[PDB]
Structure formats: C-alpha cells, structure tokens
C-alpha cells in the first residue's frame, strides 16, 4: 500500500495518529492540525526488529514526528498507569507551597495497535537516557577499564557472596570515573540558565521515584529510560512492568530508589 494511505489522508483530514489534542468541552473536531502526505523515508525503531516511524509537515507545518514500535506489549494497562501518573501530576499542581516549582511530568500517550500490536509516538525532541555523552567517557577517560571487562566482573558472580560482591565493587571503584557531567555541561551558555536547569532536572528525577515507590512501577533500565537532552531538564517514558512485581525476575527489584547517583554528580 504505497500510495493509498497518503492519498486518503489528503482528501479527508484524518485525526492525528499522534495527537496532543486536548479538545474542548464541546469537543468539536474542526480545526485540528492536518497533514496531507507522508515523508520520504521511515526510520526504523531502535529494537530487535525494524518498526517504522511516521512524520510529515503539519497544517501549521510545525514538526510532529513519531515512531511505531514492534512486538506485543500489553500497555493499555501502561496507558492507565501513565494516566495515573498524570493525575498525580495534577495533584502536584494542586499543592501551594509546591505550586511555585514546576511539577515533573511528560506523558507518552500512544494507543496500542492491537492485542499483540502497538504503534508508538516518540516525544518531539528527545534522546536516549544515557546516550548524551554516553561515549564521552572515552573522551572523559583517555585510559579506562573496558565496560566489557565490567560486564565480565558482573557475571563473574551471579551467585551472591558477602565477600564476592564487595570485591567486585572494589574492582569497580578504581576503574570507574565520576564523569556524568559533560552531557549536562555544554547545554546553554546563558547566565541564569545553569541555575535554571540543574535544580529543575534534579527535582524531576526525584519526582520519578516520588511517584515510584508509591506505584512501585519501573526498573529504570538504561534502554528503557529516557533523558531529555533538549529540555535542559529530564523526562522518561515507556515503563512496562510494575506494582513491585520484582518476583517475576530471577532477582526482585533491588531498587530502593532511582539510583540517580550519576545525575547527582551533576552537583553544581
């Protein structure tokens, strides 16, 4: 179906596949932004299989891109959990003496494609959570132990011993570096900007856990997580398993809280 979808979109203004369209109480659908034709190329979703991404020029023309996802995730529940996080966010808006500070939230509402199918919509501007300066550690470290060597150390003892884990962490100590700052370094040169960004992002990453252990939802997996390079602040989405159901894994979630030690190192 090369031509048919693009042809159909032009004649009738299709409701947006990705729509942050908070319609009115009347709810009428008259002048929502409309896109006629698809883009030239559809980038694959970063994953096991190539899931496509859809983008086009808007009615106003402002970019509104998205990326569909392969697999069979059951995220209607995740949709509800996101809605719950959102209601909690409104609650965060509801408290004066907290009213002044912004409340940390960035929804990811993409309806599932089917019972075993999904279509996702990437946040407009974003980055993989650690990707920003992820490799700058090599820039940060002219000399460093291999991350593969670190994985070897991790797998050296899947069995737990009091001495073994401590010795492994001792090995981690000399090799690792407190180098988590650079991605947060070159953001903006404006005067109040740095003081603006850091407290914001810290409060953000805190609000994650702040809703978290209450929900007990998400293991902050690096691929799973999201960090907002453009924002000068952080936001994550796409959590999948929840309710402290750590028992499913061979090890339950050894996560008292979000181990944002690296972002902490962005100490100012």
């Amino acid at each position: 179906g090369y031509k048919w979808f693009l042809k159909d979109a032009a004649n009738y203004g299709l409701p947006p596949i990705t729509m942050n369209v908070k319609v009115n109480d009347t709810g009428d659908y008259s002048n929502i932004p409309t896109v006629s034709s698809f883009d030239d190329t559809i980038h694959f979703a970063s994953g096991i299989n190539a899931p496509k991404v859809i983008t086009c020029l808007g009615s106003n023309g402002h970019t509104y891109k998205q990326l569909v996802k392969g697999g069979n995730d059951d995220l209607r529940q995740d949709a509800v959990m996101e809605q719950v996080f959102e209601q909690v966010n409104g609650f965060l808006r509801s408290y004066r003496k907290t009213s002044q500070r912004n409340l940390s939230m960035r929804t990811y509402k993409v309806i599932p494609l089917a019972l075993k199918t999904g279509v996702i919509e990437w946040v407009q501007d974003t980055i993989p959570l650690g990707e920003y300066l992820d490799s700058a550690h090599k820039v940060y470290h002219p000399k460093e132990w291999s991350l593969s060597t670190c994985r070897k150390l991790i797998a050296e003892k899947q069995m737990e011993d009091l001495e073994t884990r401590l010795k492994v962490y001792d090995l981690v100590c000399r090799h690792y570096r407190p180098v988590f700052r650079h991605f947060f370094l070159e953001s903006y040169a404006d005067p109040v900007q740095w003081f603006t960004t850091q407290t914001n992002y810290a409060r953000s990453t805190a609000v994650a856990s702040v809703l978290g252990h209450v929900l007990g939802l998400g293991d902050r997996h690096g691929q799973n997580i999201l960090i907002d390079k453009t924002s000068g602040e952080v936001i994550h989405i796409d959590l999948g398993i929840a309710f402290e159901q750590g028992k499913k894994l061979p090890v339950p979630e050894c996560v008292p809280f979000r181990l944002t030690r690296d972002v902490v190192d962005g100490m100012g």
Partner: protein
Amino acid sequence: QLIPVITTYTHLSEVENKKYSLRFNSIDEALDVELLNRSKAFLFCLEMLKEVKELGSTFKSISSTSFKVYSQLTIFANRVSFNNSTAIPFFSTKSVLWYCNRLFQELEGFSSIPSVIDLVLRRLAIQLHFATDEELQVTISFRLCAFLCFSDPFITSNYLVMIVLRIARQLLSIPCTQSLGLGIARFHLKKFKPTDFQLAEFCMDFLGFCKMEAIQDFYTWFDGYVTALNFEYEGYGFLRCQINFVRSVMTTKNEWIEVSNKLFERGHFLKRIAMNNYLCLYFWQVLDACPRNVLHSLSLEIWKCYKAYDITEFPDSLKLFFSDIMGWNFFKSPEIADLNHYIPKTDPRLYEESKLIIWKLICQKACSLLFKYDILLDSFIEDCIRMFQELRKFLNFPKDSIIYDSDTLVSEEGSFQWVKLQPTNFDSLSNWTKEETLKLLNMMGKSSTTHSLKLLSTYMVGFSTSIIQYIIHLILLEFDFNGNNKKQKEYVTQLILSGLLNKNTNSIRKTCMNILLYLLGHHALNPFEANYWVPINYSVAASTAYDCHLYEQSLLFLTIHNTKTDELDITLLSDILSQLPCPDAYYGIKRETSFKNILLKAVHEKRSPLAISYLDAANMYRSNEDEGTKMMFSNTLNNAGFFSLNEFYIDSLKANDAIDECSNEVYASAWRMQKWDIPPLSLDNKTTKDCLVFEVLHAVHNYAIYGNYLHLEEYINKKLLLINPNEEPDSLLFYALAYDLKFLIRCNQSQFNCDILQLLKENKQMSSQLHECFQL
C-alpha cells in the same frame, strides 16, 4: 596648485567666454588629478559663499530654466528670502553660476565619485559650524543651499540621500532652513524609496516643536506618499500615528490595533526606545491623547514595556501621564518575573575561517558607527575602512551596492587640510578599562589598517570602547589563539591576571571573564580542556564570583572548578547560595550543629514555626552579646506575622538607641500603629521604600484632617514627583498607591479595582511566582 581656483577667478573676469583648458590633465590614475579636481570643487565652494554675492537679492536668473526651477524649489518651502547681506563684495554670484554650468559640463562624469561629493558635504559641515552670527550663518546657509542646487544627476547615490538626511539635522538650528531641509527631504524621497531590504530613521521623522502650518500639512502629505509604501505597509513606521498627531485627527481603531501589533513585530522596538530623545515621543507623545478604550484595547505590550523605555526626561504632564498610564492596565494581568534566554553566541560554528566572522561583524558595526555621532565625526573613522585597497572579500560580506559607492577613485582623506579633524569636542572617558584594553591591542602590531583604526578610536568617541563592546571576543582572538603558537599568548594571559584583581571595573573584568568564556571553541574534544586553555584560576574565579554580587556567575562555575579542583572551599559556595534569592537554596551545604544552628534554621527559610525558640533557651542565649542576631531578631519581629507583638516590639526597639529616628523597624511601625500622631520621616527623602510608604500615609492622614482635595492631590503629586520609573527596585511597588487613594477620595464607593479576590482566584502563582513579589 591653485590653478583651478585661478580658473574660477578668471571666469568672472572673462566676458562672453566659456573655456575649459587642461581639465583633469595627467589623467586621474593617481590621487593627484582627481585631488586637483576636488581642490577645484573646494575653491568653487569658497566661491559659493561670500565670493559669490552674499546678496540682499536672492532674485536672479540661473541661466537655465531647470536650474532656476531647482533653486526656486529649494527656497520654496516657507520662502522668506532677501535678508541683508555681508560687507565685502567680491564678484557677482551670476559668474559663479556661469562657471558652475561648464563645471557640471566638465569631467564627462568623472570626479562624481564619493570623494568630491563628500568633500562638498564636509565644506557644508564646517559651514554648519556649531555657533556663530545668525546673519552670516544665514548667508553661508544660502550658499550651501545653492551648492545643493549645484547637484547634478551624479548625486544619485544613496549616500547622497543620507547626506540630505544629515542636512535636516543641520537645519534643526533654524526654522526657515528647517523648511528648506524639509523640501530637501522631499527631493531626496525619490532616491529614498528605492531601498529594498532608513525606515527606522523615518520612524520618528518629526519635529516636536512644530505660521507655516500648511508646511506641516504638505509634510503630512509627503509622509502619506511615503505610505502610498502603498505596496509595502510592512515598514510600519510610527508615520501614520505621527501624521495624525500633527494633524490633530485621531487614527482609525482598526488602524490603531495594527499600529499596536506592528511594534512588537519590529523586534528592535527596544532599539526604538533606546533613542532617548525619541522616547518621550515614542511612549504616546501625542498618542497620550486617546481613549481609555484606545489605551486598553491596544496591545498591552505598550504598558508591558516597563523598566525598558526610560524617562531620561519628559514633560511634567508626561511624568504624571505615564505614572498614571502604568496602573489602569497594570492592576489587570500584572507580571514581574523574567527568564534569561540569551543569544546563542556560541564560539564554535564551523585559521582564516575563524577570522572570517570577526571582520564581517566589524563591517556590520561600522554602519551603526556612521549612524550615531555628530554630523561630522564620521569621516575620521571612514579612512581605515577605506584603508582596510586589499580585497579581503569583506566587501562581498557587506552589501555590494553599499560597497560600490566607497569603491579605485582618488582616496581623499576626510581631514582635507586636517584642520577639519576632530576638534576634541566632548571628550569621553567612559569605559576607561576598555581604553586600557585598547592599549593592550596597540601593544600588538597585528594589522596595518586595524592599528590605525584603534588609534583613531582612541581619538574617536569611545570607538575603541565601542569595539571592545562589539568584540570583547574577537579582540582577544587577535590576541589569543590567533594561531597554533602566538607570541601574544603570554600577554593575553598576563592581561587576564592583571584584570583579575580589578576594582570599580568589576564589570569590565567580568566582561573579560565571559570573553574568556568565548575563547566555547572549535577543534577540541574536552570542554574541560576549554576550561584549561584560556587563562583562568579557580581561586581567581571564586574571587570574581564573590565579587559578582549577582547569582548568575557562581552556579555552574563552582562545578567547573570542581572538575578542575573539586576542593571544597567551604566558605565560598555557602556565602553564595545562602545569599541567593529564590527558595531552592538554603540547604546546599551540610549543617554545623548548634543552637545558633537552630536559629539559622529559623531564619534562612524564615520558618514561621518556633516563633522565638531562638530568642532564648534553658542555657544558651541569656548573654550571647552579639548584635548581628539583633538584626536577626528585628527580622524575626518583622516575620512574626503578628503586627501587634511587633507593635510593642517597636517600643522594644524604642528603648534601644539604635532608631536614629529613621528605622525600617520604626517605619514598619509607622505602617502599623495607625499612629497618625507618630512623626514620619522626611518627604524630601530620595527613594526609601519604607519612607515612601510613610509619606503616603502622612499625606492620606492629612487628607483626612484637612479639607482641600486639591491640597491632598498636591501633596500626592509632589510625593510621586520623585523619579520612580527607572533604576530602582520598587517603582511599581510605589506606583498605584494614590491611584487607589485619590480614586477612593473621588466618588463615595469602594476601591476602583473590583477586588484583588477574583485575581487571586485566577492568579495561579503566589508572587505571580514563589511569593517574592505578590504580597503586602
């Protein structure tokens, strides 16, 4: 030499003969021949004034219908001719005209280049000397207007139109000459319209002073023609509004809305305000005469421009008018807080490639340099630009049409005989540390044109200061990182070191510091290496930080030093954050346990709980003997939230001989006790906020006690007369106080604003933010 002047002289002597001999011989490949033609033009100009008949008889025959018509047009606007003339008659101006006819016929289009015309303009500029006899000035001005009439089509260049524009400033001396310059602008308008990408200059092309009313009427007609551009109304100068204002006719409502919408779209409306003399015009000089519907229905940004369009001056009526104009919209939709998104100004963008941007920016700034100065100061800085000739393709960077005019032809110095050099008028010493930086750049023998330009800048009106402002980065870029290994590197580092210890130029030192910050850069893996490359010391960095007094510098700088050093200079960041506005602070460092630490916990957050748990204890505060906590407890009395416990505390200080009859605590009491008998501070006080309140109160109390409403209003207007609008924190914080007081006095009801209650209902923010602002 003087041979062309000899020809000009013999022209009058000759009868019925018109001869041109050896015109531009030794063809002008060198500066000599076109320079001789220019000396001829100067001799003819000297002929034009006082050698041509000063004339009590402007009446004559120009010997050409077109030339005579041009002269009549030049004198036409409000023509009051035929004043008494000078003493010594040398020759009839008719011979001058006859010679000028062949002179225009001469050169076959040569010498029309900017050199000779600019020489004529300089002749007029010296003629437009600052001060002299009015009648001799008038005669010389008649000569200048006639020389303007001696302008062939060869004056078609845009630079000539700009010279015509400067002629209006020259005319600002006199009204009849002002009408002459108005007609000259009328003539120039044909050339003025060709601009494709001056409109800003026209944006207020008005004479506020404003007999010949129909002259202003035809001026309005010409302005409408300028709007008839008919094709382009996008230029959208204040012209329609100003034409209405002079016309005493109100504008169309939809037109008013359009005028409102355009100004924000200008994006340089800040620069529009920047013209100080323009400002009192610009904030509704005659548009202050308009409806409250006109005031309010407009774009609010007019009101919203607070703390920007400063009243360096205004009419007393204007002062009252603006003090009013703030409030009636200010109560609704007020806003104070501001973000700090700056120009990206990133140093790396893509080595002559690096050098490419700097000179292009210098060329861009040269146009502004030629804009804002005296009518004559320009040429002194022009030469180096002409000197800068070798084609660095910099002209290609600027406008090509602009480049062609100052193409080549004989390069003639603006100085002429060099008496017309800078007369040392109005020597400025502001940005003296920038002059020191200019001396530093002079220590570097970088460029032939640039060093002479810097020296002229030293002779010029802060032009080296203007350059440092324009290039605080590119200047050191010439100094530092000019190449792989630059001999000026040690000098740049030493300059950084010397400037580190600066005092009273801490702004200049910080300018150098962020300039170092501009050293951002290309071809480097590590931004930490960027922290390394330019001269800086974390110790000196924190020195500057403690010197900043402003929260902007310290924050990410601490982290940068942490990457460099990480040593916990305990006092530094503590003093920083603790004395930082916004509540996010006050917990950064760990606590040093103490009862005094309990007090600190009370104070920094201004903790409402535990009202005086720091005042005393079981075994701690009975005999502390420190008076800093005396201020602390004064603040506690302020923050108690009980105006009465503090009301007695007013006496609790009254026992103390620390009042000195002017105390923030005592003044707060003045706000407090309703004690109309308590004597308030002096009304002549400059700006003290507590005092401002005390004055407002004593005034209102009289407004109760005495009868005369006009007397109360007089007290009020006098009190407000102190300069509120600019350069202080609490201006609006005194703004509408009487805007309430008098309205309450007005007509027997509650306050004019309906109630702050519905506003608080829709406020959604406590200061309009964390309640730094909205309170009290």
